[PDB]
UniProtKB/Swiss-Prot annotation:
Belongs to the glycosyl hydrolase 22 family. It comes from Homo sapiens. SMART domains: LYZ1 (SM00263). Gene3D superfamilies: 1.10.530.10. This is Lysozyme C.
């Protein structure tokens, strides 16, 4: 599923992402935008280290979900990476919260640092009723 902007904003809010561990909804929107273009079926194989990024948040198989083909990988969200490719983003949201409970917080995603950090992300939630 390719979410429309405000549709995702409200979907993320209902799932409890607004202010989760101090991260505003706008930051999460900026993250999903740059990571997948709000596409839950998005995938990117990393030939360099044999890992794959899954879903709307492009969560990596090396540490967060199990796909059975990433060497010495971990599964911190304790989910099949397939759960990160559903139209329903509940599981991807549970896993994204898990990622941010770690020291780095939202900085876990390099794209967030590149395209969201210290930037005016207001535009991502404007007019969405959140």
């Amino acid at each position: 599923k390719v979410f429309e902007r405000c549709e995702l904003a409200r979907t993320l809010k209902r799932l409890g992402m607004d202010g989760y561990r101090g991260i505003s909804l706008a930051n999460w929107m900026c993250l999903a935008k740059w990571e997948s273009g709000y596409n839950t079926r998005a995938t990117n194989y990393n030939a360099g280290d044999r890992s794959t990024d899954y879903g709307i948040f492009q969560i990596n198989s090396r540490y967060w979900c199990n796909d059975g083909k990433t060497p010495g990988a971990m599964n911190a969200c304790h989910l099949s990476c397939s759960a990160l490719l559903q139209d329903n983003i509940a599981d991807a949201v549970a896993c994204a919260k898990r990622v941010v409970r770690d020291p780095q917080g939202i900085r876990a995603w390099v794209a967030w640092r590149n395209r969201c950090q210290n930037r005016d992300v207001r535009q991502y939630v404007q007019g969405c009723g959140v």
